[PDB]
Design a protein around this ligand. Structure first.
Ligand SMILES: Nc1ncnc2c1ncn2[C@@H]1O[C@H](COP(=O)(O)OP(=O)(O)OP(O)(O)=S)[C@@H](O)[C@H]1O
Ligand SMILES: Nc1ncnc2c1ncn2[C@@H]1O[C@H](COP(=O)(O)OP(=O)(O)OP(O)(O)=S)[C@@H](O)[C@H]1O
Ligand SMILES: [Mg+2]
Ligand SMILES: [Mg+2]
Lengths: 379, 379
C-alpha cells in the first residue's frame, strides 16, 4: 500500500540522480545494465514448506482471511501442486505453462524444470490487502515419485524468497527423511527460516511440550547451528480453540508471527535502499576511473601506446584515485576484469569528468536519503 | 521399605538354591566369587548434574521434604562439593577421606582421585523415607580450576548410577562448554538421563517456550541421538508459584518426575532378579562341564593324557552338552578362557553330577521366581 511511495521514491531518485552518471560513462557495458521498473516493484515472497495435511493451505487462507483460486483444501497428493499467490485486480488464475513466459514475473527461470512441474504450478491472483505487500508460495505437502526434482524446486524458491516458513502440526509431528533432506537444502539461508507449530490446541498441554521438544531436538540435530530458530506455536485458522489452557500463549505467538510477516516489506525497502546506495557509489568510482583514463590520453599521437600503459598501470591508478577522493578500495570493481574490458574501448571517446553529475549523486546520498528512510520509519 | 522383602527373597533363594551348586563345582574359581549380602542390598543412586545456582541442592531438599547435613544452599564455588545423601539411623555426616575406606560403601574406588577430591566429598546421612529406597548424589555446580579431574569424577558416578538428572533453570539457561563436555561424557548411557527445566514459573509463558526450545535445540545438537530425551518442566521447591499460567502443567510434570524416581527401586529389583537367573543358568552349565570332565576320566591310568584330550576337545564337549540338555550356547563361558583355567585342576578331584543340586535350581527358576516377581508387581 503505502510502500508504493517508497518504490516510487527509489525509482525517481535513481532515474534523476544515478542513471545519468551511469549512462555518461557506459556503466551498463562494464558492470550492470540499467535498472528497470521491475527492479523496484518487487514484493517480498514467503515460501511455505511442510508435510501433507499440516495446514499450509489453511494457513494462507487464515492470513488472507479470504479464499484464493484453486486453493483446494485437503487434496490428493498427485493433484497437490505449487501455487504462487499474488495480488491481482480480479480473482483469476494462470497455469504454470504460461506463467513461465511472463516477463513481468520472477518465475521465468523456472522453465528449466518444465512439463511435469509446470503442470503442477500456477499463479492464483486476487485483490487482497495482504497481497499488496507480499506474495505467498504454497508448496505441495511432503508425503510417491513425482515428475520433477522436488528438492531443487524447493531449493530454487528458497534462494529468491525473503521468508521460509517450516510448518509442523502438533497432532502428528512425523519429521520424515524427505522433509529433513529439504531443510538441509535450505541451510546457508537460516536467517530466512521461521517455524510454525500448528494445531497446537489439538493436544493436551503436556503432549504439546513433548512434541515441541522433539521438534527442536531434531531440528538443531539437522540444521547444526548455534543460532536457535524461532518457532511460532498456535492454531492458525478461524475456528474456535479445542484445548483452551494455552489461549494467551497461542494469541501472543500469532501476533509475533503477524508482526514478522508485516515487517517483511519494510525490510525489503531497506535492502533496496542499500542497493541503490551501493550502486550509486560504484557509479562514482567507475566515473572517476573512465575520467582519469580520458584525462591522461595524448592530444594527438601515441594513443594506442598510452592506452596500454594506462591498463598496465591500472592498479596504481586505483590507489591514485583512492587518495585524491577519499574513497574506499572496497567499492572498486575488480582490477583484472576491468583491464579485460577496457581493451574494447577507444579511451579518447570517453567523456571527461562532469562535476555536475557527481554533485547530483552526492547531494542525494546526504539529503534525499535521510527523508526516504523516514518514510520507512513510519511503516 | 517393602523392597527389603525382595532383597531378602533374593539372598535366601541364592544361598539355598544357587550357592550350593556354585560351591560344589568351584564356580568361584572360574567365573565369579560368591555373592555377599552387599550385592543384594544395593539401593539405586541418582546423580544430579547442573550448573551453579540452578537448584540441585534445593531440588534434593524438595524431594526429601527435609534438610540434610551440610546441604549449604547457595555456597561459594570453592566450598561447593560432592555430597552422597544416603539413609542413616541418625542425622550425621562422614568426610570423604574416611568414606573412601568404608568397605560397606560403593565409593571405595573413588580413592584413586584422592586428596583434592576427598576434601570435596562427604556422605550426609539422615533417617528419611526417600533414602530407604534410593540415594542421591549432589555434584558441585558447574561454573575456576579445581584440584581434581571434574569430568572423570562425574563420568565415574554416571557409570554406576541408575538415573542421571541434568538440571537447567529457565530464568538463565546458559549451557556452557564445561557443561556440554560433561553431557558428552555421559553419552553411551542415555537411557539413564532425564532433564529438569527448573524455575519455570520465574519467566512468562512465551519466554518459557523460547528457553525450553533452546534447551532441546542444543541438547540434540550435542547428544546426537534419534531418541529424544524427556524434560520435566516445573518449579521444584516448596515455595508458591510466581507465574501461575502453567500451574496445571508444572504439577503434572512434577508427578511424572516423582513416578520416575519412585520406579527406580522396582527397576533395580527386576535387574537383580535377572542377574540371579543368569548366574543360576551359568552355574548349571559350569556344573555340566566339570561333571562331564570328571565322568570321562579313566579309573586309574592315563590321567594326565586324558586331561589334555578333554581340554583340546572342549569345543566339541560344548556341543555334546548343548544337545543332550537343550541349553543355549549363549550362557556357556568362553571356550579358550576355560581351557586356560582347566590346566591348574586335577580332573579326578571334580565331583560327579549331582541331580539333587540341579533340581534345586530348576524348581527355583519355575516356581520360586514367579512369586518373587509378584512381590515386585505390587510396588
Ligand atoms: N489449525 C488447525 N487445527 C486443526 N486442523 C487444522 C488446522 N488447519 C488445518 N487443519 C485441517 O488439516 C487438514 C489439512 O489441511 P490443509 O490446510 O490442506 O493442509 P495442507 O495439506 O498442508 O495444505 P495443502 O497440501 O497445500 S492443500 C484439513 O482437514 C484441515 O481442516
Ligand atoms: N524452584 C526455584 N525457583 C526459584 N528459585 C529457586 C528455585 N530453586 C532454587 N532457587 C534459588 O536458586 C538459588 C540457588 O540455589 P541452589 O539450590 O543452591 O542451586 P545449586 O547451586 O545448584 O545447589 P548447590 O550448588 O549443590 S549448593 C538459591 O538462592 C535458591 O533460593
Ligand atoms: Mg495449503
Ligand atoms: Mg544442591
Amino acid at each position: 500500500g503505502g510502500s508504493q511511495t517508497v518504490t516510487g521514491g527509489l525509482r525517481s531518485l535513481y532515474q534523476r540522480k544515478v542513471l545519468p552518471l551511469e549512462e555518461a560513462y557506459r556503466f551498463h557495458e562494464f558492470h550492470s545494465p540499467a535498472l528497470e521498473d521491475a527492479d523496484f516493484e518487487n514484493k517480498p515472497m514467503i515460501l511455505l514448506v511442510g508435510q501433507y495435511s499440516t495446514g499450509k493451505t489453511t494457513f494462507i487462507r487464515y492470513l488472507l482471511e479470504q479464499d484464493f483460486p484453486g486453493m483446494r483444501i485437503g487434496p490428493e497428493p498427485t493433484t497437490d501442486s505449487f501455487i504462487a499467490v499474488m495480488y491481482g485486480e480480479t480473482e483469476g488464475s494462470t497455469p504454470g505453462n504460461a506463467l513461465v513466459v511472463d516477463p513481468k514475473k520472477p518465475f521465468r527461470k523456472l522453465s528449466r524444470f518444465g512439463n511435469a512441474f509446470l503442470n503442477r504450478f500456477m499463479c492464483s491472483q486476487l485483490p487482497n490487502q495482504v497481497l499488496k505487500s507480499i506474495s505467498i508460495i504454497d508448496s505441495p505437502g511432503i508425503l510417491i515419485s513425482r515428475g520433477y526434482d522436488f528438492c531443487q524446486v524447493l531449493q530454487w524458491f528458497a534462494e529468491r524468497v525473503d521468508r521460509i516458513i517450516l510448518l509442523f502440526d502438533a497432532h502428528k509431528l512425523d519429521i520424515s527423511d524427505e522433509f529433513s533432506e529439504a531443510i538441509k537444502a535450505f541451510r546457508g539461508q537460516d536467517d530466512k527460516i521461521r517455524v510454525v507449530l500448528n494445531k497446537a490446541d489439538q493436544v493436551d498441554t503436556q503432549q504439546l511440550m513433548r512434541v515441541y521438544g522433539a521438534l527442536m531436538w531434531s531440528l538443531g540435530k539437522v540444521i547444526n547451528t548455534p543460532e536457535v530458530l524461532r518457532v511460532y506455536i498456535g492454531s492458525f485458522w478461524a475456528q474456535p480453540l479445542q484445548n483452551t489452557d494455552n489461549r494467551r500463549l497461542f494469541e501472543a505467538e500469532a501476533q509475533d508471527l503477524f508482526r514478522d510477516i508485516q515487517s517483511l516489506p519494510q525490510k525489503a525497502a531497506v535492502r533496496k535502499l542499500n542497493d541503490l546506495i551501493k550502486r550509486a557509489r560504484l557509479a562514482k568510482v567507475h566515473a572517476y576511473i573512465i575520467s582519469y583514463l580520458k584525462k591522461e590520453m595524448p592530444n594527438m599521437f601515441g594513443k594506442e601506446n598510452k592506452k596500454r600503459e594506462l591498463i598496465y598501470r591500472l592498479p596504481e591508478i586505483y590507489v591514485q584515485l583512492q587518495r585524491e577522493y577519499q574513497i574506499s578500495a572496497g567499492d572498486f570493481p575488480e582490477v583484472k576484469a576491468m583491464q579485460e574490458q577496457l581493451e574494447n574501448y577507444d579511451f579518447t571517446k570517453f567523456h571527461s569528468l562532469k562535476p555536475k553529475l557527481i554533485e547530483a549523486v552526492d547531494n542525494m546520498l546526504t539529503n534525499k536519503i535521510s527523508s526516504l528512510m523516514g518514510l520507512i520509519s513510519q511503516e
